């Protein structure tokens, strides 16, 4: 790896100025290098780790759905034929996107989660794999559409036994958690009303838990709830 | 699209 | 090259595309591939070719932007050692940035530029050599900041000799490379009195040659002059 | 910065 003569710290230190550059495929190898020194990360290390790929996936994400949107609409009747470049173009967008949700899984399956004892560490790893296999899901279509649903589901479903049984329903990764486990069953498994149910019981259950916490717990957690609430709207 | 963290 | 393979229509829709998805790495990467053709490019063309480097090296500048304000801290009294990586990381940046100039120039010089004979052409291509000099001075300190600086007034100056002759003052392209002329004095040449007069004239005289022109042709330009103004405003 | 276009 070309990060592998960098000392871990100068690695983790790049990575906070690439983020601060909005630099996040900087980031996102940096970080990796940093993963593959071997040892755990900390908190802060793992939330690099995890704004690093969620952003590159992100743009990755947003140029794919813009692509296939154009590639849908040329497929519609009375479209003119216009040759194989959309399908090209999307297909190499596709491919990109892909590699990178492999290459997060690949350092979630050596060796983070193997490593990761503790729930908070435990429960972010699953919670990343569920994510990366939702966003590989995105774009399946052949004989493994169902085989990755699968995996995100089993991800985050480890995730989900976790959390409940070793965090407070108000821990932000555990609201997160939810979250995205509720946009994956609306989203990728045609589940709509387990997405709802999902979001509100956690949303509830952490209205109850609030008035254990700080001022500043009482933070990220409300906004994390706020998210909820926003589907819930977007979703009823 | 529905919110994500 | 990587874009030899493919069809120079393909490359070009590829990079309406790439523009569309917001991935103007790949869409300059497309038009590099076009260029290298070897064919002329039509107006659009060159549109494509200044949109997808102008927002790839702006990323760059931005990024540069912020780490070198952080170096530049770093350096400041009482301000704690942290080690050479921000200078290396800063330095990285740079020379990606370097890169990308040096690859646009290339094209410009390898063929674009002496094939150029009507005047939009000629002024654009000039105008980009300057505004990629301008970059490179931006990040130059050593032996050749000032070769670089004057390469980028030659190419600039030589735009201006052409657009004044063969272009009316309304006309876009003589519009812009005046407004990137004027930033260039007052940004990397330390000529303020010569940017503000520059814009002043430019924007005085496309404002006598409006009457000339259809509601669409009082468009893009009577939008550039406001930029002439607005520069104008933060100088004075 | 200033404008540039
Ligand atoms: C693998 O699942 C990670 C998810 C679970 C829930 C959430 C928590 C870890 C959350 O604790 C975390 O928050 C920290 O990292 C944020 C980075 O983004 C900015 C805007 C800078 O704010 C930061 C916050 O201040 C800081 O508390 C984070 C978010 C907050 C803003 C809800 C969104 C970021 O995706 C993340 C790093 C991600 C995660
Ligand atoms: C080498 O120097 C190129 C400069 C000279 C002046 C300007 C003209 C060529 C101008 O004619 C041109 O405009 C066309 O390309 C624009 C691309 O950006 C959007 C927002 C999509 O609007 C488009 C306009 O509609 C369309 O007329 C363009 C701009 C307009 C908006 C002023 C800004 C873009 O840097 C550029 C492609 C660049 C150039
Ligand atoms: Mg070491
Ligand atoms: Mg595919
Ligand atoms: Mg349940
Ligand atoms: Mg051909
Ligand atoms: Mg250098
Ligand atoms: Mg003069």
């Given at each position: 790896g070309a990060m592998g003569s960098?000392?871990?710290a100068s690695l983790i230190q790049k990575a906070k100025l690439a983020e601060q550059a909005e630099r996040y495929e900087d980031m996102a190898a940096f970080?990796?290098?940093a993963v593959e020194k071997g040892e755990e990360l900390s908190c802060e290390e793992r939330?690099?780790?995890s704004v690093a790929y969620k952003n590159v996936v992100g743009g990755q994400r947003a140029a794919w759905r813009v692509l296939?949107?154009?590639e849908q609409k040329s497929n519609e009747e009375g479209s003119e034929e216009k040759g194989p470049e959309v399908r090209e173009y999307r297909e190499?967008?596709?491919?990109?996107?892909?590699?990178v949700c492999d290459?997060?899984?690949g350092l979630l399956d050596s060796?983070?989660?193997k490593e990761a004892g503790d729930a908070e560490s435990r429960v972010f790893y699953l919670k990343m794999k569920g994510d990366y296999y939702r966003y590989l899901a995105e774009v399946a279509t052949g004989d493994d559409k169902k085989r990755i649903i699968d995996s995100a589901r089993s991800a985050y479903q480890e995730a989900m036994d976790i959390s409940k049984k070793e965090m407070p329903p108000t821990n932000p990764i555990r609201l997160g958690l939810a979250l995205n486990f509720s946009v994956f069953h609306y989203e990728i498994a045609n589940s709509p009303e387990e997405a709802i149910s999902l979001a509100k019981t956690t949303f509830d259950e952490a209205m109850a838990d609030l008035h254990t916490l700080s001022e500043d717990s009482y933070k990220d957690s409300t906004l994390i709830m706020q998210l909820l609430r926003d589907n819930l709207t977007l979703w009823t | 699209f529905p919110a994500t963290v």
């Amino acid at each position: 790896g070309a990060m592998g003569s960098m000392e871990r710290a100068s690695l983790i230190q790049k990575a906070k100025l690439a983020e601060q550059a909005e630099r996040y495929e900087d980031m996102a190898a940096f970080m990796k290098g940093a993963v593959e020194k071997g040892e755990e990360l900390s908190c802060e290390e793992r939330n690099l780790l995890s704004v690093a790929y969620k952003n590159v996936v992100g743009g990755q994400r947003a140029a794919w759905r813009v692509l296939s949107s154009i590639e849908q609409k040329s497929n519609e009747e009375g479209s003119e034929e216009k040759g194989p470049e959309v399908r090209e173009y999307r297909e190499k967008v596709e491919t990109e996107l892909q590699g990178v949700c492999d290459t997060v899984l690949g350092l979630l399956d050596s060796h983070l989660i193997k490593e990761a004892g503790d729930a908070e560490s435990r429960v972010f790893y699953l919670k990343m794999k569920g994510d990366y296999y939702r966003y590989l899901a995105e774009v399946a279509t052949g004989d493994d559409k169902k085989r990755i649903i699968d995996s995100a589901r089993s991800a985050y479903q480890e995730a989900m036994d976790i959390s409940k049984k070793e965090m407070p329903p108000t821990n932000p990764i555990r609201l997160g958690l939810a979250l995205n486990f509720s946009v994956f069953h609306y989203e990728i498994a045609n589940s709509p009303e387990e997405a709802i149910s999902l979001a509100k019981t956690t949303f509830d259950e952490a209205m109850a838990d609030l008035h254990t916490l700080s001022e500043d717990s009482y933070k990220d957690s409300t906004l994390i709830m706020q998210l909820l609430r926003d589907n819930l709207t977007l979703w009823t | 699209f529905p919110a994500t963290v």
